[PDB]
Amino acid sequence: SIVTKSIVNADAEARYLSPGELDRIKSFVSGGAQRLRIAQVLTDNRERIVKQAGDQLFQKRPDVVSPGGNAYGQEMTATCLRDLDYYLRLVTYGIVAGDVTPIEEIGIVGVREMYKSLGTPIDAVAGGVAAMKSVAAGLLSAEDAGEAGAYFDYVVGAMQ
Amino acid sequence: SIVTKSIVNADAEARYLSPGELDRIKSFVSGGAQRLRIAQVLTDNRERIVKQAGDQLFQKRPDVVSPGGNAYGQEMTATCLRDLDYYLRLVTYGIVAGDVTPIEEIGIVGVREMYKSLGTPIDAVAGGVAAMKSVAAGLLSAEDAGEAGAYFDYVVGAMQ
Amino acid sequence: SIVTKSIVNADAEARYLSPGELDRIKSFVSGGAQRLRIAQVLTDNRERIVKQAGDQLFQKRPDVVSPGGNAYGQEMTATCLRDLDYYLRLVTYGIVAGDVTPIEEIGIVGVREMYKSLGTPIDAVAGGVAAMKSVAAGLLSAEDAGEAGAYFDYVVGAMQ
Amino acid sequence: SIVTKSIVNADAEARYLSPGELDRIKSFVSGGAQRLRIAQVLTDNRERIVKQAGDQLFQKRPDVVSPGGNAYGQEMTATCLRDLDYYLRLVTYGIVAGDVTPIEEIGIVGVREMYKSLGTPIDAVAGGVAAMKSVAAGLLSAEDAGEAGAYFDYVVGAMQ
Amino acid sequence: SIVTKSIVNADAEARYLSPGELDRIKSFVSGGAQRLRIAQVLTDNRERIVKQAGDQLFQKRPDVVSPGGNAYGQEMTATCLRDLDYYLRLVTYGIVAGDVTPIEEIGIVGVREMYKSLGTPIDAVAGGVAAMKSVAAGLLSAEDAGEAGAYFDYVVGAMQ
Amino acid sequence: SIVTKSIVNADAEARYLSPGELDRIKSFVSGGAQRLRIAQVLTDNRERIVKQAGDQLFQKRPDVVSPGGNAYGQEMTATCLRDLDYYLRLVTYGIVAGDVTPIEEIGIVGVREMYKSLGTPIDAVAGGVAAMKSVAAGLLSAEDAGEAGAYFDYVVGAMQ
Amino acid sequence: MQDAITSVINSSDVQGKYLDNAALEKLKGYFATGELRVRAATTISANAAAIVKEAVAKSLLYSDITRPGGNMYTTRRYAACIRDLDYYLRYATYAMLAGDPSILDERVLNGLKETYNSLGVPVGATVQAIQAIKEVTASLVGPDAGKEMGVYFDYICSGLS
Amino acid sequence: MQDAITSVINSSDVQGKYLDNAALEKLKGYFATGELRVRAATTISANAAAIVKEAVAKSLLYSDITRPGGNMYTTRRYAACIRDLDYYLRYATYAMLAGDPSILDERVLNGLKETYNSLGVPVGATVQAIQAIKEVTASLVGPDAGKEMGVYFDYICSGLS
Amino acid sequence: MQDAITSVINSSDVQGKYLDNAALEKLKGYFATGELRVRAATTISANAAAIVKEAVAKSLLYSDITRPGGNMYTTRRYAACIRDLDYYLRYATYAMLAGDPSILDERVLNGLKETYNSLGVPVGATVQAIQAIKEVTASLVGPDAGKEMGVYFDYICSGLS
Amino acid sequence: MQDAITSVINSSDVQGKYLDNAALEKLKGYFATGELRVRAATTISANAAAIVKEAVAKSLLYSDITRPGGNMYTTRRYAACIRDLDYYLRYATYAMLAGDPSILDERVLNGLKETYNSLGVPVGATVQAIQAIKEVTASLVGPDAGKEMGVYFDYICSGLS
Amino acid sequence: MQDAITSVINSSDVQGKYLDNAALEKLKGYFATGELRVRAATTISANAAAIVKEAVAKSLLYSDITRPGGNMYTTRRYAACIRDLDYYLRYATYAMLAGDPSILDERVLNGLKETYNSLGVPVGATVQAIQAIKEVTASLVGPDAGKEMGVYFDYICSGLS
Amino acid sequence: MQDAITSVINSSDVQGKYLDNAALEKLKGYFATGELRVRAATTISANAAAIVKEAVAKSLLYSDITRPGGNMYTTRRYAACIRDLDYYLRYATYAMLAGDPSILDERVLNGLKETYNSLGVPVGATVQAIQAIKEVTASLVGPDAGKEMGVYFDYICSGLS
Numbered sequence A, B, C, D, E, F: 001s002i003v004t005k006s007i008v009n010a011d012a013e014a015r016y017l018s019p020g021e022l023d024r025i026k027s028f029v030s031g032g033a034q035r036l037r038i039a040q041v042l043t044d045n046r047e048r049i050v051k052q053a054g055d056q057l058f059q060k061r062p063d064v065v066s067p068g069g070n071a072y073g074q075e076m077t078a079t080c081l082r083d084l085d086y087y088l089r090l091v092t093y094g095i096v097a098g099d100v101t102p103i104e105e106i107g108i109v110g111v112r113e114m115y116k117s118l119g120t121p122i123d124a125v126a127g128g129v130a131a132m133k134s135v136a137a138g139l140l141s142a143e144d145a146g147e148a149g150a151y152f153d154y155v156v157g158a159m160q
Numbered sequence G, H, I, J, K, L: 001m002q003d004a005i006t007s008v009i010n011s012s013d014v015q016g017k018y019l020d021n022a023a024l025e026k027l028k029g030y031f032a033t034g035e036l037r038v039r040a041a042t043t044i045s046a047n048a049a050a051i052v053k054e055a056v057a058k059s060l061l062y063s064d065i066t067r068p069g070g071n072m073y074t075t076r077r078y079a080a081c082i083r084d085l086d087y088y089l090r091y092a093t094y095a096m097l098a099g100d101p102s103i104l105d106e107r108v109l110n111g112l113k114e115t116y117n118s119l120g121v122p123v124g125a126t127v128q129a130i131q132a133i134k135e136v137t138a139s140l141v142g143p144d145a146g147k148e149m150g151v152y153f154d155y156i157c158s159g160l161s
Ligand SMILES: *[C@H](C)[C@H]1/C(=C/c2[nH]c(/C=C3N=C(/C=C4\NC(=O)C(CC)=C4C)C(C)=C\3CCC(=O)O)c(CCC(=O)O)c2C)NC(=O)[C@@H]1C
Pocket: D064, D069, D070, D071, D072, D076, D077, D079, D080, D081, D083, D084, D086, D087, D106, D107, D118, D120, D121, D124, D125, D128, G060, G061, G062, G063, G066, G067, G072, G073, G074, G075, G078
């Protein structure tokens, strides 16, 4: 969370938080209700966001659901959408925390090593997450889509 | 500034800025107008802030303006207020930058060596800067005095 | 070559070549005619080795020549077989040199970075090289296939 | 002492003491009676050395015994003289040891942090020690004042 | 042996053995029968190699078996031949290992310090080992004497 | 010299010479005439010191003047005495300098590598220098022999 | 370390769940009074040296502890002791901002009792000094914020005992 | 390096001046754009590999440069070239966040022409690739951010020539 | 570490003995197998990632261990687990080349059980995964080399128990 | 470490006392022995290799300890053992110059018994060798200096037991 | 570095000669000045900060050099300048003790002109400050020692020009 | 560095070609006489110290160069010079094995003339010593191998001139 990130940064310099850092935490707490509402839109629409993102991905990358592809067949395709649902869940955690740390610690450290071992094309996983961003944005105000978008972009960039 | 600090930290790790670093830049620039207003109050009141701080200082540190004192006489007292005016100018730079780096680079690295050579009691320089903080605080909201105060406190602590 | 590798290893330890290194060079030069003959079999049969390896790869990984796949279409498929011909050429250089250094310096340093940028699944490139090993082995004695096989295995392992 | 300093230097070079180090120990112990007499003069005159040094300091630094000053009032002034008596005691230890390490280990490591916390201007503490040097010097031969002076100078320089 | 050296080097780089390291192990083990035969000639003739080397040394260096000499008298001369027998045994270990490491670890690290403490002239020990080389060479083919000679030369050089 | 050693030590600690270093220079120059007389007595007696030391060495180390020995024959024996005369000259330089560094810089750095290349047993060179010490001591007061002896001892120890 | 927010996220993550009503109520509980934590931390930061100075004056000075033979005698020991009190105040402030004492276990207390015992640092006097820091801090941040800071000061003291 | 803010502070400091109206106008200009610079940097970071891939496909591939004898032939040289383009994009992004090209002189261009000349790296082909990165970047970040990124791409190219 | 040759030399040296008939038989035994060990190591190196992938698919995936609450949940823990299996295969290959398990005691097992117990890494699941690596390796290197590799896989598993 | 001078300073400092008549008389007592300590140290330095040689010949040579299976077998172990004896003589000489054994606790004995036990160095044989060094040293420096050196040799031996 | 003693030793060594009458007379000439050099060095050491302070006041202060735009503006540059003057006084004092300027070439002047020119440190002003140090030093150590110190101050200045 | 084999591979690779008849004839030219290079290298390795010793005795000893005033006077300079001759022999042997002098440009000659000129190492005498190494080497490896070694010795000498 923004609170832990601020504490870790201050502790690394053996110092108290600055007035500016404390003001950032005040803004975070005052905006908490709005962040919970944004996270709740993604939670409430998770089935449609994941389903439509999967459809967009498989239209761009039909090879991954073709013979020899990592997601070929009903069971592997379902597992692929299960992973997209994991990443959407992590994006909701990042939004409420005001920081990508929960996403990083749960879903990013070691992600290239995991998908390399599985033979999953991680560029296509990133495309699935980018598709979820686009579907989620359709359910949000321009302002709320801007906020949520940063968390999806973090995941996409961390997989590239 | 926080922009340069973020870039230097990212470059040291051969990476793009983190989402946290980018959020810190967003928070910094959203406060820009308020920082410029604080800097302008100190700039516009610089003669009175330095004059009144000097008067307050000589009462706490009679030694420096007593015969044998570093600031004894009209010319040396004027040079003392010249130095306080330098530090007020640097505090305005720190306020607009959102960090102490301009103050550090111009007025703090080597400050103990310079004043030791000149025979200036650096505890009394710190007292003069603390007096400027108190005069400036009278011209500012509690919130704005908190922000400006961090920069005065940095200078006082670096001299103590 | 085995000669350069032996010299570089000895120079790193500020020493003359070891008796082991010199024996390897004696064995290498006495076996030179046999290594040139093995390399000439791969050179003479490069069309069939590359064509049959490509067919084996595309049977195991039809996704790479399906829509969305990196080798989709006649031009991209031809470029894929061009890369297999590059690696067969490098394998002939390693065989004549008695060492993988020419393979490493021309085709392995940076290979993951190159194929990642191109979007080529490097596991499938490794599969193509493994298929060339199997086709080439059919054109060689058991002993000669053992020697050539080490160079193909080096490339396959370096792409994992 | 000079004996420990010689042993530490020899141990750092995994060697027996040098002929020069052994000669310095012989010269040190032959001069021991004279060092003990210097320590005895400072010990016997400790009340007058500290009282006179305090008066000289408070004339040069009237701020420390003025309202708001660290030593303001009878009790705080007595504590200030208690500290000068501590430093005179440590100077006698250095003189008998022929080495500053006893002074360093008791009264110098962390001294700036201690006096900063207390709000005591350490430049004024250094001035009090310099005043003790000047008062003590009048009780000693030119040779003995030279020897004692090095230990007072060590303390003054270690507080600067 | 080259097997352990290759494993230690590979482990230091968190990698499998290189093709070059594996080829060096193949060359090493293919020579095993020849190395065992050379070691067996030295083992079978150990009494004569040590006795004749001792006689050659004492003819070249009569001082070591003359009054005042380290090997003077029946008991000390027997201890001298005991040491030459130790070094012949270590040479057989080096020959079977295909490198000097067993000789280094058992008989060379600290050898100068041991013989200096004992007052044994290490140049004469080296002469005894050089004499064993010459006697052993008479029992070997030119090729086998070349191989064995490197191990005796290592010991002679390590004592100079 | 003692002056350079004091300056090098002071420069390494970014400081002026210590009172102890300055006192040692004063004591050194006051004894300078006596040091110069020691160097003159060794210079005046150099032929006998070297000749007698050579005789003592060749009696203790008959191997070096026996067939196969480094000093075997008239010409090589003369060169051996030439080297002892070099070391006596260097000892006179150390005595006048009050420091071993002139000896170190001319005759010790790389000495083992030089004599190893030449096949000269350096322990016998050390014995020759130790023998010169004993002859020189007979020409000097107990105090002057103690001083000269430290410089002979330095050379002997540096060749062990 | 964990804060009040990450503790909730972690408890949802181990279940593989999106934040449910109970989790959201815990997050709302942090947001409801988080500004009061920021206000207390602002005051403590501005006064950190003064808090330690007053606590030392009230609990340690002019006693056997600072005189020859005492564990705060010598400038090195005096400086080490005030450095430790500075640490306790700084980390207690972090823990209060976080609403979670985990940073104290991770960054303050791990091996601390053993270190003090091995060096002969008196735990009783340290606990008296921490109690003084708690009282001085409460005078500046007000009774309610002083009670919350007291939770973390007491956590550190218990960790020494 | 300097950013737009520090450049103004430094120019005022060398004159011994408080910030004047002209200086304050430059600071206001930076603050008014900061969020747009962050938005562009976020997009570029998320797409950095894809930007270089598309630029390389447009400007370098299927030419003499990637064939035997060309400077991008061998996997090592191909990888070195895309690493250079990754550097140009990452540093141009820093310069755009800073609103100042000084980081490019300090950390990218110092000795670069001399390095390329000593190694035989073709400057013309590199400049063509940077032009392609500028076009691809502008397609993703929009015209205004694309123009601003273009200033820093052109600054790097000029520095090679 | 020791290899099969150095183990024999060391056992003869501690007795002060020249190599006797029993020692020479052990050396002959190693030399007669060296090329077969190199052939197996070449195959394993070329297939190392694929061996671990197949073992993981057979023994760990689609279970409580990879789901939330399981010890392979989170990308960091998944990656740590396959890193451990990569270590077991690489070190078992070294031990097979050496014909001696001493490298496993020195570089793999020293404190490993204690590390797994302190972190909550499940030993039973790890042993099942190593058994799967043994089976997949044997399929690639053939029965004799598979049996020899099995000695070292079993040595690692025993060291965890 | 402390020497006889700093022992007196430390005992006065813990009381907050200037050196009194009794303390100055203890310093005079040390200064009156300084030349005798230097004379002994000069003789030991000149004979250091010879002392260890004779002690080893008397206590260790021509025994199971130097033969295969013994802890002084191999040139590396022989050299390590005589290096340890060289250390004991050099540090005992320092302690005798200092008139205080504290250097032995700080620089010699801290963890030494544990190191020897972990490596299998026989402590009984080491103590016999130190006894031999004590006897040889006493023969060279005379009875009074031999007794004083014996205090420090016995201190090292007791520290191993 | 060389001193007046090692200059004589080096000139004798290059000839392969024992010290002759001329060499001994040169050494006597140095020994006859040693106490005067020590007396001057003692005075300079006791007044080192005061010498630099007075020289700076006479030659640099209240000028364009200390104002914004000058090379001594900013505390870092002021401190660097007085550090350089501290170096010149300390090294000139060493050279005077040595009776030889070689330490100045080896430890002060090697690359110094080039460093100053690359940084924009004004050499004219530096030489004026060294002239002021020479005058202030001469006032304290007296005419003969002032002249000898002047040789080394002038040597440093010539090395900058 | 390149050897005779890698030079051929590189010339084929820059053309994108499998080895053609002309390339195979160049490889056969290396293989035809490569055993003679190995035989010479074996002899030189076994005699490396003896070759340098005899060359020094023939070309440098008992001359102005080793007497006071000469560049091999002082043990440090004697040792540096024989170290340089050891380097020339070791690298000439590598170049002979490679059949290519490129290792000499890369690892011996780059900046060597400039280093010798700055230190005052006489190139004439170095070339005379290398000529002596060439003659002594030729006496041991025979005239034909001595001529091939001479190519590389002459390459080093030319590189100094
Ligand atoms: C006198 C020249 C200056 C001065 C002194 C002053 N000191 C204190 C308080 C203390 N000083 C110490 C000192 C030491 N403790 C040690 O272990 C050592 C090493 C031997 C020293 C030197 C301590 C511990 C204290 C705290 C009180 C205590 O003894 O427990 C004060 C009192 C400040 C107060 O407000 O209580 C003063 C006045 N003050 C000046 O301004 C002079 C320049």
